[PDB]
Amino acid sequence: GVLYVGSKTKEGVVHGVATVAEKTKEQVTNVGGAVVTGVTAVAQKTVEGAGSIAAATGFV
Amino acid sequence: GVLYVGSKTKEGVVHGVATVAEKTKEQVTNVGGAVVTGVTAVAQKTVEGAGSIAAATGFV
Amino acid sequence: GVLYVGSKTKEGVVHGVATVAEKTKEQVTNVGGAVVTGVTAVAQKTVEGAGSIAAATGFV
Fold it and tell me: Which residues of A touch C33 (CB under 8 A)?
């Protein structure tokens, strides 16, 4: 049971993501894996998870 | 039981993410894994988790 | 049982994240894993967790 009358509702809203980058430098050497990412923006209302960032084993 | 009448409701809202970067330098050497990330913005209303950042075993 | 009449409600709201960086330097050497992250902003109303940052075992 739920009712709305003239209601401005906002659920799970994202407003603006500014990620102005510059002259960066990211070097990777002799690793098991590079999992470098960037901008991650998600909008949800009813879920069982989100953005997952997982690595794995390495060896030298 | 829930009722709204002329109500401006805001649930789970994100407003603005400024991440202006510059001349950074991130070098990785002889590791089991690099899990470098960046901007992570999520908006939720009813969930069972969020942004997960996990690594894994290494060896030298 | 819950009722609203002309009420401006704000639940779980994030307003502004300024993370202006500069000329940083992060070097990683001979570790089991680098879990370097950046900006993490979440907005929730009813959940069972948040942003998790976990590492894993290493070896030399």
Answer: 55, 58
CA dist C39 and C45 (Å) reads: 20
Give the tokens for residue A54.
Answer: 């997982």
CA distances from residue B30 to A9, A31, B47, C36, C48 in whole angstroms, order as listed: 51, 5, 37, 16, 36
Nearest to B30 among C2, C21, C30 (CB): C30
Rg of the Cα trace of chain C?
20
Tokens of B46: 């009813």
Q: Report the structure determination method.
A: cryo-EM
Pairing of strands C2-5, B2-5: parallel
Burial letters A40-59, b for 16+ CB under 10 A, else e: bbbbbeebeebbebebebbe
Specify burial of residue B36 (Cβ count, 10 A radius: 0-12, 13-18, 19+).
buried
